[PDB]
Amino acid sequence: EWQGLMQFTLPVRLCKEIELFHFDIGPFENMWPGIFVYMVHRSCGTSCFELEKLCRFIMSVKKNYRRVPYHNWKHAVTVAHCMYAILQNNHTLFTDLERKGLLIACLCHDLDHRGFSNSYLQKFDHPLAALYSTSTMEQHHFSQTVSILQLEGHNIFSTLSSSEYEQVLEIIRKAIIATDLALYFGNRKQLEEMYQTGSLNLNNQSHRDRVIGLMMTACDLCSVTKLWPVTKLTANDIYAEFWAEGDEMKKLGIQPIPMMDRDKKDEVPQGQLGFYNAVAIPCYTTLTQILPPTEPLLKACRDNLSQWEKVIRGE
Amino acid sequence: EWQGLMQFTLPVRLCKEIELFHFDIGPFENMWPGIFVYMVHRSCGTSCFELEKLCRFIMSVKKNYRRVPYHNWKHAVTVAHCMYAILQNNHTLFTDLERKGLLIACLCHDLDHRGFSNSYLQKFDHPLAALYSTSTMEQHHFSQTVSILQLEGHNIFSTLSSSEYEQVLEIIRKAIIATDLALYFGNRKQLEEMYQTGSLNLNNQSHRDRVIGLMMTACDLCSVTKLWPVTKLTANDIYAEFWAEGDEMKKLGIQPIPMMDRDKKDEVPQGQLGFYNAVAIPCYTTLTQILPPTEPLLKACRDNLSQWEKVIRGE
Numbered sequence: 001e002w003q004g005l006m007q008f009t010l011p012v013r014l015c016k017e018i019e020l021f022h023f024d025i026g027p028f029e030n031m032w033p034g035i036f037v038y039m040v041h042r043s044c045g046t047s048c049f050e051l052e053k054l055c056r057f058i059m060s061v062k063k064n065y066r067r068v069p070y071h072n073w074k075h076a077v078t079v080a081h082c083m084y085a086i087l088q089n090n091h092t093l094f095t096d097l098e099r100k101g102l103l104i105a106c107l108c109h110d111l112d113h114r115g116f117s118n119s120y121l122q123k124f125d126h127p128l129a130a131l132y133s134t135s136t137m138e139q140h141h142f143s144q145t146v147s148i149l150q151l152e153g154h155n156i157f158s159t160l161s162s163s164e165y166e167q168v169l170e171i172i173r174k175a176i177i178a179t180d181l182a183l184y185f186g187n188r189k190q191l192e193e194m195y196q197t198g199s200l201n202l203n204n205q206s207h208r209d210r211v212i213g214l215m216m217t218a219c220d221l222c223s224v225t226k227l228w229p230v231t232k233l234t235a236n237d238i239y240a241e242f243w244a245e246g247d248e249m250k251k252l253g254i255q256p257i258p259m260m261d262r263d264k265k266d267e268v269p270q271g272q273l274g275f276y277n278a279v280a281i282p283c284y285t286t287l288t289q290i291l292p293p294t295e296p297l298l299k300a301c302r303d304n305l306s307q308w309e310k311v312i313r314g315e
Numbered sequence: 316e317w318q319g320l321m322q323f324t325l326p327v328r329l330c331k332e333i334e335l336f337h338f339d340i341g342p343f344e345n346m347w348p349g350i351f352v353y354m355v356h357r358s359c360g361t362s363c364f365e366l367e368k369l370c371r372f373i374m375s376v377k378k379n380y381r382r383v384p385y386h387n388w389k390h391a392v393t394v395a396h397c398m399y400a401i402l403q404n405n406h407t408l409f410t411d412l413e414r415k416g417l418l419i420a421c422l423c424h425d426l427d428h429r430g431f432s433n434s435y436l437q438k439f440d441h442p443l444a445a446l447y448s449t450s451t452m453e454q455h456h457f458s459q460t461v462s463i464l465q466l467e468g469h470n471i472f473s474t475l476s477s478s479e480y481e482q483v484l485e486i487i488r489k490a491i492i493a494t495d496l497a498l499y500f501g502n503r504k505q506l507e508e509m510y511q512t513g514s515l516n517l518n519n520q521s522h523r524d525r526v527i528g529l530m531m532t533a534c535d536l537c538s539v540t541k542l543w544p545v546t547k548l549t550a551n552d553i554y555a556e557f558w559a560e561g562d563e564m565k566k567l568g569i570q571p572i573p574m575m576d577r578d579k580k581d582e583v584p585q586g587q588l589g590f591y592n593a594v595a596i597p598c599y600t601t602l603t604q605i606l607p608p609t610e611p612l613l614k615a616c617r618d619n620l621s622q623w624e625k626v627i628r629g630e
């Protein structure tokens with residue numbers, strides 16, 4: 001398969017549309033691997049990786065996403081595309097290494113997800129929770145990334161100096177860890193403070209790591225920034241996973257939280273309203289303040305919030 | 316009328332156009348019966364049906380389509396033409412009996428449609444729903460097909476062996492039942508799994524039946540695969556039917572669903588995008604995987620999807 005990927009060319013119509021935040025990859029499944037190649041080439045340059053290695057890496061990444069309702073290969077590519085659009089719109093704020101690192105980190109950020117939350121694994125003493133006591137799945141996702149990199153002919157970072165190889169793995173590690181939404185709340189609070197006091201400094205590495213973290217959250221959640229019908233269908237996939245986790249809990253005699261309880265579908269519109277107000281809107285608001293060209297993400301999120309409000313009022 | 320049909324010759328300027336998936340029969344109403352004869356002849360051969368019986372059959376089928384906005388004679392011929400194009404592009408795969416059966420099934424697949432959904436007939440205890448509890452209209456369509464065959468001078472299959480006759484009727488029965496969209500979702504999910512696990516085997520009659528079922532769906536929905544002006548205009552006919560059904564419900568003091576509600580007219584473009592993502596795209600995607608020459612249908616579906624997005628966005 002990776003050999004066919006090498007001759008792929010993005011159709012011209014898509015070349016225009018792919019640059020836009022609202023682009024939905026959904027209708028183009030056969031093209032997703034080629035879309036990632038395209039994005040890496042446009043953002044990082046056509047000789048950034050050896051094509052054969054990049055194509056082998058991409059195909060192995062795809063193979064290592066499971067056929068679960070939401071945390072699947074489609075999700076990986078959707079998140080990578082949102083990152084592409086953020087980077088393209090803020091290109092010179094980030095180094096070559098950061099752009100490479102972040103695109104790869106986005107593609108890999110949910111590798112081998114089994115459709116269960118960190119809370120579930122920790123509460124029910126899964127072996128991954130023994131290995132990774134905090135940010136359990138996210139450490140596993142980074143573990144999986146390194147594991148794929150070290151496969152025969154898969155090492156896309158082979159030409160880097162050791163120093164730069166270390167830097168990029170560290171960029172990738174931090175970015176993947178930051179997708180643990182438990183970490184987002186504190187991150188966003190610190191950044192909002194820094195922005196209000198006028199103290200945010202991108203040349204300050206700790207400030208920089210925080211901005212990158214927020215970008216990762218923004219990308220991870222971007223299904224809430226698509227057109228309404230797309231956002232609604234994605235919500236169905238997200239809840240399919242939540243409910244399947246809740247069902248496992250009920251078998252072990254434990255009441256799930258409302259969002260994981262399929263007997264509480266009525267509260268979904270209000271659940272979505274609550275998530276947009278407490279998580280999504282704040283995320284894209286802070287992002288827009290730090291990186292103004294990302295405003296369309298906030299606008300789109302606001303549009304979908306409005307749609308959920310309509311659902312609540314009776315439509 | 317059936318006599319004048321026997322003399323019909325398709326205009327040469329249409330001999331290449333008619334082979335294209337995106338061919339629109341729209342401008343050629345007086346030719347529709349002759350177009351069906353032409354397609355039968357090229358696909359099944361001028362030998363397989365006695366011309367007079369075929370011509371009488373076609374004319375009785377036409378008269379048994381009602382004057383409804385969408386499920387009318389034009390839709391019958393449109394669906395038959397898409398099947399013709401699938402069969403012509405995959406000519407090794409299907410037996411003589413299958414090609415015969417499938418063209419006939421498509422022409423007859425909505426016979427005597429009244430413009431009401433199965434859900435409606437079942438909800439309001441229509442006699443047809445008392446008779447056929449599931450796939451209500453589709454069982455009716457098949458029954459109408461058998462009734463027409465059993466008219467004097469109408470049995471186009473009279474020269475088949477007793478065995479061939481019951482086989483072809485079963486092919487038609489299964490093909491018409493498959494056009495109940497309620498059944499498509501499970502059919503396509505099964506096929507996707509079979510393809511993905513490499514267990515799909517066209518020696519297996521149950522597998523053949525599933526593939527034929529998907530082809531039927533693909534042809535039934537093929538208005539979403541025409542050039543944009545044709546697709547857009549057909550969408551009006553479809554909603555005219557949905558809305559008349561919703562209106563019939565209001566008259567009875569009963570609240571129709573969003574799709575049936577003419578007060579949700581402004582939401583049509585969003586509803587189309589939803590339908591394309593949830594139904595049409597997966598349909599033509601799976602079909603293209605199983606039957607690569609059907610690829611132009613998926614390509615045309617994607618093009619119309621982007622047109623609906625542009626409508627939503629106000630482009």
Ligand SMILES: COc1cn(-c2ccc(-n3cccn3)cc2F)nc(-c2ccnn2-c2ccccc2)c1=O
Pocket residue numbers: 117118180181182220221222223224238259271272275
């Ligand atoms: C109530 O509705 C929702 C709830 N959560 C949600 C998810 C996770 C956590 N969590 C707490 C601690 C760690 N993780 C909390 C949450 F609230 N996420 C989404 C959502 C919208 C788009 N991606 N995304 C998503 C993000 C991650 C996983 C699944 C879905 C959502 O729509």
Ligand SMILES: COc1cn(-c2ccc(-n3cccn3)cc2F)nc(-c2ccnn2-c2ccccc2)c1=O
Pocket residue numbers: 432433495496497535536537538539553574586587590
């Ligand atoms: C919202 O837009 C649409 C919705 N449906 C639609 C239709 C049916 C069902 N159903 C019946 C039973 C279970 N489910 C669900 C549906 F969603 N069909 C079309 C469509 C596009 C092209 N043919 N075709 C069509 C197909 C069949 C009937 C009418 C129209 C459409 O455009």
Ligand SMILES: [Mg+2]
Pocket residue numbers: 109110137179180
């Ligand atoms: Mg994750």
Ligand SMILES: [Mg+2]
Pocket residue numbers: 424425452494495
């Ligand atoms: Mg029908």
Ligand SMILES: [Zn+2]
Pocket residue numbers: 075079109110179220
């Ligand atoms: Zn994710």
Ligand SMILES: [Zn+2]
Pocket residue numbers: 390394424425494535
């Ligand atoms: Zn039909």
